[PDB]
């Protein structure tokens, strides 16, 4: 019942794309500048859900300059979405070898191990990722999701500790409070509307929230409520949220059981 207008490409995204084409076609770029700008267009293509175009730019960046951690991160994300967890692990390991401070590679490798049926090792990554910024509610959420496959009760105790330790300012702690039992689905959605200031903040909240809701119903065995919720997360077109990409993977898994 809470719906956003599904996001449309902004005029700035489209102007920048058309400008990135004119510049990449020119000889105004050093090898290093060319590689940086192929990475930046890949991020933009990815922002619009144009993953094959993005991968194409990311691979051209590497061809020019193979020591780019940023690009290895997006390549592993894409191997995760395709279900090739093995290759994905290799790409993120490459990230952290090139730059051991590239924190989001712990996130994304954690997520990939999770979908890969390796929760103990996913907890190693997501625990680390959590330690690097504990007031990010989505780190407590991703850690929780992995730890509930090992031990459902200690997961909820740890999640509850993360919430009580935190300053609880970031909106996402409301999703944690739902996971914990502190609030109802209806209160969650009521706070969702209150905190959204415009259609874009609305869409982002919905993409995030409906994915975590999707996971909740999927753990009770409610495939129809799960499927709807994943679809409605993905219908906000916030391509490039982990929640959008893992909503799509979950729908892919619900498809591949038919």
């Amino acid at each position: 019942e809470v719906l956003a207008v599904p996001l449309q490409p902004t005029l700035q995204q489209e102007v920048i794309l058309a400008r990135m084409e004119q510049i990449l076609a020119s000889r105004a770029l050093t090898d290093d500048e060319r590689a940086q700008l192929l990475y930046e267009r890949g991020v933009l293509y990815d922002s619009l859900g144009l993953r094959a175009l993005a991968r194409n730019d990311f691979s051209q960046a590497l061809a020019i300059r193979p020591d780019m951690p940023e690009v290895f991160n997006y390549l592993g994300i894409y191997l995760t979405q395709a279900g090739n967890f093995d290759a994905a692990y290799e790409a993120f390991d490459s990230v952290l070898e090139l730059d051991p401070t590239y924190n989001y590679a712990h996130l994304n490798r954690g997520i990939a191990l999770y979908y890969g049926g390796r929760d103990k090792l996913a907890q190693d990554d997501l625990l680390a990722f959590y330690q690097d910024d504990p007031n990010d509610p989505f780190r407590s959420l991703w850690l929780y999701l992995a730890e509930q496959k090992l031990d459902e009760k200690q997961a909820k105790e740890v999640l509850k500790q993360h919430f009580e330790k935190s300053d609880k300012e970031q909106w996402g702690w409301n999703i944690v409070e739902f996971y914990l039992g502190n609030i109802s689905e209806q209160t969650l959605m009521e706070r969702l509307k209150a905190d959204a200031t415009d259609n874009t903040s609305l869409a982002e909240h919905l993409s995030e929230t409906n994915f975590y809701l999707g996971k909740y119903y999927l753990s009770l065995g409610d495939l129809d409520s799960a499927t709807a919720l994943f679809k409605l997360a993905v219908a906000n077109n916030v391509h490039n949220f982990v929640e959008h990409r893992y909503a799509l993977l979950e729908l892919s898994l619900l498809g591949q059981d038919q």
Binding site: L62, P66, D67, G83, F85, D86, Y89, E90, D93, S94, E97, L98, L113, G116, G117, R118, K120, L121
Partner: protein
């Protein structure tokens, strides 16, 4: 000219730090087996590294294992961070303690040899307690040099010859020990990790200039060689290779001597593999001869002479023939391997089998190491309308069914599948499917049980050599990604296919098979696929089995092979334990020869063939008969008789 510690104390190259980290990523994350590299697992890794350094527990002292085994549980963390020094500090120590044994052994070659006692030698010292003091270490190499001395005596050598052979063997053992690279220490370190997970997992050192030169001249006698510590072992054989043709060679056979175009047998015991394999790889036509210690018996060594060549296609091809029995007929397809194109060849020959009015068909898959999984499925599908043939599970949980989907049957008459302990992967899938569908009787021995698949992955990364050009090419890992399951939901791992009629060598516990490999993955089940059984032959089993036992009771081939099973099972508790008395050992040698000669001469009198007076006069190309095939033809005819009723 090594007389004390001139063995250079080896150290890790700069690359090895990274490579340990890279290898630990792939095994700990990508491996089909889901293990924790925690406290317990590092310990088991430590143990297997010791057993790789000192297989026989006669080089290290219990005081030398204890010095490093305080931190055995810590070796997980060390492999992650790429701290190699515990591996190098144990390999540099064991290298000096090995030098200690071979100089002490040269000392014992001067003492007198006395083969007159009641004493024995245990060849398995693998779960033996470690030696306490230098008194155990010289008692065990007193024993070792006496066994080495009696081996050479029992092959007719004088006191003189025996002392000079072991002198060279103990001095080359010392000299070999100072050729070993840092690459050899790292290779074995990773192998301790690899082989604790499962026995098909491996680290593989980069190929040098030498591999490049062989390809430059691009022969291998059609075998793949693995190593069980201190022995060059035949791991697998290629279908229709010269190795595979001369049937005197079976999987798990140990090489202890190599021959030349014309020359004597040079010992290859205690060697590194690349150098052993270099002796064999020679120009086509000019043959090479190899000695063979076979699996699990007091070391009576066979010598085989084989010529070299490339895999000729029609030898790898399926071969068809008709057995007749008075009036009745049985087609036989000898399938050596599952090559791409097999199912098309089979269809051609099945239509020739339709012409010759046969009442049943046998598919012979004895000693067939698998091949193309796709051909297993199509070939399976020739005998069923349509259905799933095999379920495949991956490292990430995904299960996939491979199917035959044409609702066609190209034979549909009575079918037997003949298998033995060397039928692997593809052969198992075909036979398992024919049993589960109720389509065919399975005859012979329990199959190999290798129900997993492995792939290679490079440890090279696209940014190595922009960031570290000093570095050469790096290695590979080899790890298990997939596990086969039947349409019944049973895995082929470790059990493979149990035949409906087990031919006598099969019930008895075997030496070879996945179920005897070290740390083999377990057998497990999944949910059955949905399939329609084409028939049911459980009705016929008791009558088929009783007519089988009736015939093999009256059969001198089967009678002989059952008396060696009563012999091999009675002397089973004390099977590795080998006597050190020359009179008892020459007797056991003489009687094996007398038996073998009397078995051959009983065979020749049946065949009308002139008798042999010495076992040495037997031509080197003598072909053993196949009573397993001849009995399987009668089983196939019993089934046609029982079925048509």
């Amino acid at each position: 000219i090594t007389r004390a510690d001139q063995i250079p104390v080896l150290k890790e190259e700069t690359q090895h730090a990274t490579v340990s980290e890279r290898v630990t990523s792939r095994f700990t994350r990508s491996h089909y087996r889901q293990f924790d590299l925690d406290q317990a697992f590092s310990a088991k890794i430590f143990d297997r590294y010791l057993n790789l350094l000192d297989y026989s527990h006669n080089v290290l002292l219990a005081s030398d294992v204890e010095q490093f085994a305080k931190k055995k549980t810590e070796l997980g963390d060390e492999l992650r961070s790429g701290k190699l020094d515990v591996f190098y500090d144990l390999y540099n120590l064991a290298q000096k303690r090995r030098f200690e044994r071979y100089q002490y052994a040269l000392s014992v070659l001067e003492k007198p040899m006395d083969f007159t006692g009641n004493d024995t030698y245990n060849l398995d010292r693998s779960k033996a307690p470690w030696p306490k003091n230098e008194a155990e270490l010289n008692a065990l190499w007193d024993s070792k040099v006496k066994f080495d001395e009696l081996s050479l005596k029992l092959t007719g050598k004088t006191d003189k010859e025996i002392r000079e052979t072991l002198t060279r063997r103990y001095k080359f053992a010392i000299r070999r020990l100072a050729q070993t690279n840092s690459e050899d220490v790292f290779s074995l370190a990773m192998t301790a990790f690899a082989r604790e997970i499962d026995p098909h997992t491996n680290y593989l050192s980069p190929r040098n200039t030498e591999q490049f030169n062989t390809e430059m001249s691009l022969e291998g006698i059609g075998a793949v060689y693995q190593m069980d510590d201190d022995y060059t072992v035949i791991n697998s054989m290629v279908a229709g290779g010269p190795a595979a043709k001369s049937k005197a060679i079976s999987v798990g056979d140990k090489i202890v001597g190599v021959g030349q175009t014309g020359k004597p047998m040079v010992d290859v015991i205690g060697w590194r593999l690349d150098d052993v394999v270099a002796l064999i790889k020679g120009p086509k036509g000019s043959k090479v001869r190899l000695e063979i210690l076979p699996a699990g018996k007091g070391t009576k060594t066979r010598t085989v002479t084989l010529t070299r060549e490339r895999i000729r296609l029609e030898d790898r091809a399926v071969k068809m023939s008709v057995k007749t029995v008075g009036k009745e007929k049985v087609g036989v397809l000898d399938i050596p391997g599952f090559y791409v194109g097999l199912t098309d060849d089979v269809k051609v020959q099945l239509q020739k089998l339709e012409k010759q009015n046969v009442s049943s068909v046998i598919i012979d898959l004895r000693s067939n190491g698998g091949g193309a999984l796709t051909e297993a499925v199509s070939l399976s599908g020739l005998f069923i309308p349509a259905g799933p043939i095999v379920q495949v599970r991956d490292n990430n949980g995904k299960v996939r069914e491979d199917s035959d989907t044409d609702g066609q049957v190209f034979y549909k008459g009575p079918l037997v599948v003949l298998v033995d302990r060397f039928s692997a992967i593809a052969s198992e899938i075909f036979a398992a499917a024919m049993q589960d569908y109720g389509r065919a009787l399975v005859v012979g021995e329990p199959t190999f049980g290798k129900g997993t698949v492995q792939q290679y992955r490079s440890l090279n990364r696209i940014y190595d050599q922009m960031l570290r050009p000093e570095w050469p090419a790096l290695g590979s890992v080899q790890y298990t990604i997939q596990k086969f399951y039947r349409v019944n939901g049973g895995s082929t791992q470790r059990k493979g296919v149990t035949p409906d009629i087990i031919m006598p060598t099969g019930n008895e516990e075997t030496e070879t098979g996945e179920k005897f490999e070290d740390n083999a993955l377990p057998w497990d089940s999944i949910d059955a696929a949905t399939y329609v059984k084409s028939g049911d032959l459980t009705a016929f089993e008791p009558e088929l089995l009783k007519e089988h036992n009736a015939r093999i009771a009256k059969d001198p081939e089967f009678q002989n092979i059952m008396k060696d099973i009563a012999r091999f099972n009675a002397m089973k508790d004390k099977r590795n334990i080998v006597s050190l008395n020359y009179a008892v050992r020459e007797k056991e040698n003489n009687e094996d020869d007398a038996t073998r000669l009397a078995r051959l001469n009983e065979r020749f009198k049946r065949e009308g063939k002139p008798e042999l007076k010495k076992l040495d006069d037997l031509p080197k190309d003598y072909q053993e008969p196949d009573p397993y095939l001849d009995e399987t033809v009668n089983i196939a005819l019993d089934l046609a008789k029982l079925e048509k009723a």
